């Protein structure tokens, strides 16, 4: 959602505001067990201890 | 988005014509110019430097 | 501080941006950055009378900093202009880099030239080679070997 402040008015006012469903990224989904299927292979992220 | 792809080229060859003009230059002989000492010196005099 | 160094000398500044769609915004972006400079706009796509007005008013010192495209590359007079600020020297041909370095100068006054760079790892490797070449050679007689760098 984009806000545009109208220049003529003082600091912080609304000319108009638009909105649309932007798409960004293809996040992998975990399966029902634990596996992330990445390239037809079946990877697993291990928990890191730091 | 209307900036995608797909324009062709090579509507007219250059290489043959460049070779032609270069061969034509290297075939004929250039002009042997004539130089005048004092006439060129009077032109040098017009140079105020 | 580059703009201030030029204006309290008294001459004028070529500030070149080379994108006409946003040069209007870049004008005020520079203008509240230096509130005491006088900024007008000039580029090759105006109505071919306001351009001449801008350049002649520039020629009569009516304002200090000119935001411009590479229209100035046509090699105008007014040696009082003594500082080039190329805002994005990433995308500019090295021969006309030398040409724009020739634009300032023309005077006994010591001209200046700041070539703004983006962050060094962001840019093209070829741009880095270009900028190392232009940072190596700052003399007279160095135009030709700079073409051997081209």
């Amino acid at each position: 959602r984009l806000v545009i402040y109208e220049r003529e008015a003082p600091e912080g006012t609304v000319k108009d505001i638009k909105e649309q469903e932007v798409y960004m990224g293809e996040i992998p989904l975990m399966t029902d067990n634990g596996t992330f299927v990445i390239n037809g292979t079946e990877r697993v992220i291990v928990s890191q201890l730091h | 988005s209307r900036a995608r792809q797909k324009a062709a080229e090579k509507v007219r060859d250059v290489a043959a014509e460049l070779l032609d003009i270069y061969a034509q230059r290297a075939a004929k002989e250039g002009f042997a110019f004539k130089h005048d000492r004092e006439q060129y010196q009077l032109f040098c005099d017009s140079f105020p430097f | 501080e580059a703009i201030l160094r030029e204006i309290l000398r008294g001459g004028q500044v070529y500030y070149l941006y080379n994108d006409v769609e946003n040069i209007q915004k870049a004008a005020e972006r520079l203008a509240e950055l230096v509130p005491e400079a006088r900024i007008a706009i000039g580029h090759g796509q105006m109505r071919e009378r306001e351009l001449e007005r801008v350049m002649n008013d520039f020629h009569h010192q009516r304002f200090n900093v000119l935001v411009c495209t590479t229209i100035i590359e046509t090699g105008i007079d007014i040696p009082t202009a003594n500082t080039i600020i190329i805002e994005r020297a990433d995308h500019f041909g090295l021969a006309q880099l030398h040409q724009l370095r020739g634009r300032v100068g023309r005077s006994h006054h010591q001209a200046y030239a700041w070539l703004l760079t983006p962050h060094p790892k962001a840019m093209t490797t070829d741009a880095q080679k270009r900028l190392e070449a232009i940072a190596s050679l700052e003399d007279l007689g160095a135009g030709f070997a700079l073409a051997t760098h081209d």
Binding site: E42, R43, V44, I45 | - | -
Partner: protein
């Protein structure tokens, strides 16, 4: 997409399953690794860790 695919594809942690059991799957899904980004080094860890 580049940032998430680089991590899910090529990291020190997103590793290939041993699938030659049910046991080897279910104990490779609980490995507590002390390596990878922000961690210590395979060759450069003392006798204390």
């Amino acid at each position: 997409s580049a940032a998430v695919k680089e991590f899910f594809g090529s990291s020190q942690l997103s590793q290939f399953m041993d699938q030659n059991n049910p046991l080897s799957e279910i104990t490779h899904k609980r490995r507590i690794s002390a390596l990878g980004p922000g961690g210590l080094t395979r060759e450069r860890a003392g006798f204390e860790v």
